[model samples]
Target: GPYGVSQIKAPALHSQGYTGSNVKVAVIDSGIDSSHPALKVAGGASFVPSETNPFQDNNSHGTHVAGTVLAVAPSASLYAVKVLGADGSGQYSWIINGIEWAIANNMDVINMSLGGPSGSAALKAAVDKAVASGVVVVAAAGNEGTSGSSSTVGYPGKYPSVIAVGAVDSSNQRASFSSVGPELDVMAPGVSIWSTLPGNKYGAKSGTCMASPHVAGAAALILSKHPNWTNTQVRSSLENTTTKLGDSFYYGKGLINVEAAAQ
Candidate 1:
């Protein structure tokens, strides 16, 4: 439960003048700690009525992710979308509404740290619309690991337009908790990553959630340079830059290289 933000080499990438300020990341989670210093560096927070305040994070997951997104995209602005509640759970309808609102607000990137085991029609529809509107949607690939569970594909992440992500440990190996499947697109440092938390707190935690923002933040970096790359171009750039760590199942396209992505 020690939800923190991304740090070390990651944030250094941002400080190198690659801050995501050129982008706006819409965090769809329990919510963001609008009061958190690192997250505050981003921008305003928005909450879904069906869920609690998007500006408040009682469980810390949102704060942790908000921090990670800021790490790579340090200059990127944040818009909190509280579709999930403090209990760390919410209905599918909330997710749809959050994505719709983010798109309407013209968010450049949308990071979704939550996932469901199966896909929903409404969720798919929302993602389709988001992608069509030039929004980049990133999501967790569930924590089921290689249990061989057939439908672990999960909603939104599995949706065609989403940049489905899984977590990699300190060794850059897939996090033991991360689910495996063809839905997996890329991997990033997700284990023991240090970052900012609510109330100015900070700590480390791991999950596909941790890997997600790295991509979003890196996208911010690419956006900072291009300023006009479409969602497809950004997604392709990141995917094309992957290193192919040798394990197609565990490594996917390989570790996301910020340097390659920044180019």
Candidate 2:
């Protein structure tokens, strides 16, 4: 299950010269540690109201996600859209607002490492609008793993218009905690990973949260090369060029081949 950003892949993308400089990625999550040297905050906004500073992280999950995307896209422009609070929770309306803002502002991609049991009409509408507008959206497939019981796919991640990712470990095995779903479009490394952290730090994290950024970063790289390519085309290039680890449902065409993507 290649669901989340593999810490291994992000650096590979960077080394291959996929600096996401012109690609604008909006990290819609709690908040990011904006002071990392490897990350540059190109723009940002806040959709969550529970916290005063939407740019800060209390739980450090979003910071790790942000760092993963930036680490791969290196030069890709970064934006922090705080829709979740330090508690790692937020409302559907805020997420909808964040997506709308990203699209309205012409962000190249929207990286949503968020998912909950709930869904709203407004959220669905917003997603549809973003897709129509040619904005690439990515989300986590949840951390539920492969439970034989009633499988619950994360919302927004399961949305047909979005690219939902599952998590895989460094060994390229499915993470036991990653949620599996038919809507899943790709997989990335989401296990113990190393990337930039808040306040210029670095460390490892696990989850679909860790995997989504890797895809986001790769998307930025593809866009960086083919600036005129539509969202669909850029996605296709990544998929067409990926190294197939197994099936598309299992690996979403393949592990992100950064060198191939950059070339």
Candidate 3:
């Protein structure tokens, strides 16, 4: 069950005029359909070798992820940082380069909906650099929760500085596939999330991949209101303002309340 706008109180925030205007959010994923009418993608770049159009979302993941970000922060300026290839996978170097690009462009927020099983010093360093530069970095906590164990949160997300988000269903219970662990900083509605797709279409998708943009979008809202707040302040506000669901392992600080965080 995905309750759309009401689940995250987006409509309530919109009524107050916190529409994320002037916030620049970078979605580092497969790619994005910049032509999508619902998304106001300012610009983008591709780190995938031999790719010509970074604005085209051949795999549809980036577009869907970007749509979610727009859902909460509708007026935020979005940028497509194509790190993953058409096959829905890419080299870590590509992601690192995307991070560097975001920093150079002075992006206020970076949303990474993909993750690897293991940690990477290089990736962690890049994320640390972004955070130090005042860029708010958000990532998926992975979908390995059904693996029947713990500590399944993936890299980049596993990094301490990043805001790692887990998935929950419409009922506010953790999605079965959502990975859980100490790295989980928050939870969001991930299952059956309806968002934009390539070719002006819309569809529902799941995974922690769908969960991250909620937090990123929330950060956009917070930044729009408190334009001078530091990345740490934004992160702390979101984490501390959550609707507590359960323990740290399954829900982190609990499901993100964009309205609460916006205030």
Candidate 4:
């Protein structure tokens, strides 16, 4: 589960009996390894033409992302919405369908650890609708960081409706690989994060992809406590409660303090 649990102070809330009880999260990625003992996949579907089973994770990225979320919110339900294929490549249309599926299935939160090429109009509409329907959408800011200046964030993450997440290390320092931009919303521990891998195994990965689920899990925690709160309120609370780090372009509001937000 990495040091992120301690870094974001999830144990503080866990001790208070707040474990994001049953808040459904849709992870739109390359599916999840349901067989992995550490991961519990509530239910899922696949948009990938080759793989109809969302429970089977061919690419390890989705399982890792799901594991990170469960690390912070153990009781939360995770649903894998498979959009990408085994090769870790996917089309924007598939992602849009995943968003639609999340909305239709009544998911409380949607975590997109993968991003597509910037500016697909249909993709924007899908995310916009998901937000309108009261689903908290979290996306990776993309690992395209270049010199801490200019916009490197890509689609879905770049959109106003979604929360674009970047990565920080255990030291609360921004990961050089994390994409930087004005659109970037927040930071979380992503460097060398140990989470579930395929086949009931575990490994460490570093990317904004790894950082995103932390925020998604935090949203689940907030929603579990405040069921009546809108997505906007949850977003504001997390953004406002962060531990301020370096530059806004790299750190956004700061590293997400889940404990602070829950309080």
Candidate 5:
């Protein structure tokens, strides 16, 4: 029921030439296939042990995340920071190193669409360091929700400095699967959302995982227009410009409005 792009008003921003050109976004997940027709990755590195190729996505998750970010901010520079292996699991050390890579390379935004139930000072420290370095961090609120409100946000997303995104359907209603909590920063289209996958494929995958890149992409669009804005400033603009969807506890501020944030 949604295309994701229009749901966030990205096209209006696109028409104004605010297509996130040259903005560097690091997708910290499984990996990304730059060869995918829908994406053009700027560069990447692999933190997965024995899996040194970051340009190939055997897991398909990171590629899909990259596609969504590219969809909204078509010209943004995408970097594949492979933290999770093909098993869709990785240690906190891998993720922490990925954040370090992004910071060392001067990334503008970091999108972590994967996470764990357990929070760690090390993980929070990495996210804190990234934000302090002037990079905006966005993460999935998580898919651990019940039918009612719950505090399911995972580490990274659980961190206050990061933008934790929850999922909503095309109708702008919360998806039953989307994790909810006061920590959730916003909502985006995620349920059955179609996007690019590995090996030149396209499919629908649901999770707060998919919801995140919408904000990551939106953050890129904002950064492209206001290159000098601090990560907090960009976050505030996105939150302030949202279209109200529901309770702040469940939907966070609301559904992110990309065009409004860009202005």
Candidate 6:
């Protein structure tokens, strides 16, 4: 066990010689800071209007999420599919475009650390298509759990084709800001997670956004080990090997155990 990596036993798999090599992952969010020395963003494209490049991260959120993915699967090819603007918001069309881009690139996994309360049929269709095309879609359940009333997960993540992820802290308790609902598929560390930020620096952020990448990285690791495993098999392995905490309303299955999944 070694910090976040230890919590999911990712280092054990790394020691076993599988570090997600040859696995391609698309991170569809604000964008990524490809210059971050710790991150090796293979390549990417921008679906956001007025933004010609997807390598620039004006909002830091995507870079932080991408960093988490590399933390476990160091050799995984990371691609940035910028869908959100500097305001951290984007149209459903942009998301669909991003998903289509991922699918066309033949990506093995997609990490979506963003969500909204409402969804569109086009978005759902794009996600379903990606899943059907053998891409593992992982998304954040949302951070609206503290909206003064009972809250539910948001778009993309709420879709059945996506592996909705919630947030948990070091103590294995649900994070106060993590959105919850029946769509939750699993949980991962999200409280003040230390990760790469803009400007080639590092810092911590909290929310399901920070948690989704953990499972994405875990998926990359699993796919790297069993290259021919179907998306269903990958999902089942992660869910079955999780460290079950409690009810599905919060920790679905439980915090992901990468070491167990690799086996």
Candidate 1 residue-wise lDDT, 1-263, digit = tens: 12222321344455567676658888888788888766663443445564446788877888888888876666788878878877888778887888888889888998988888877788898888889999888888777777664535467778779988878775666778876777778887788878777889888877787888877777777888778899899899888888676565666677787677656
lDDT of 2 by residue, 76-176 (tens): 77888888887788888888888998998998898999888766778888877887899888888788776564445688887887878777787777778
* Residue-level lDDT tens digits of model 6 in 1-263: 22666687888888888889999999998899998888899988999997768999888988999999999799999999999888888888888899999999999999999898888888998899999999999999998874543548887899988999999988989998888877888998888899999898999999999889999999999998999999888898998999999888777788899888877
lDDT of 3 by residue, 144-222 (tens): 8955556889988999999999999989999998889988999989999999999999999999999999889889988
Clashes per model (N, Cα, C within 3 A): 8, 17, 0, 0, 0, 1
Mark the regions of model 6 whose C-alpha exceeds 4 Å error after superposition: 146-151
C-alpha RMSD between model 6 and the true structure: 1.6
Clashes of 6: 1
Error of 3 at 243 (Å): 0.7
Error of 4 at 186 (Å): 0.5
Give stretches of model 3 more than 4 Å off: 146-149
CA shift at 3, candidate 4, in angstroms?
0.2
Q: Using TM-score, give the best candidate's number.
A: 4
lDDT of each: 0.76, 0.76, 0.90, 0.90, 0.91, 0.88
RMSD of candidate 3 to the truth, in angstroms, is 1.4
TM-score for all models, in order of appearance: 0.90, 0.89, 0.97, 0.98, 0.97, 0.96
- Model 4, 1-263: lDDT tens digits are 36987898887888888888979999999999999988889998999998999998899999999999999899899999999999999888788899999999999999999876577878899999999999999999999987545788877899989999999999999998888888899998899999999998999999999999999999999898888999999999899999999888888899899888876
Give the residue spans of candidate 5 off by over 4 A. Answer: 147-150
For model 4, the stretches where C-alpha displacement exceeds 4 angstroms are: none
Question: Each model's RMSD to truth, in Å?
Answer: 3.0, 3.1, 1.4, 1.0, 1.4, 1.6
In terms of lDDT, the poorest run of 10 residues in model 4 is 146-155
Query: How many Å off is the CA of 154 in candidate 2?
Result: 1.1
- Work out candidate 2's RMSD over C-alphas: 3.1
Can you give the lDDT of residue 29 in candidate 5? 92
Ten-residue region with minimum lDDT total, candidate 1: 1-10
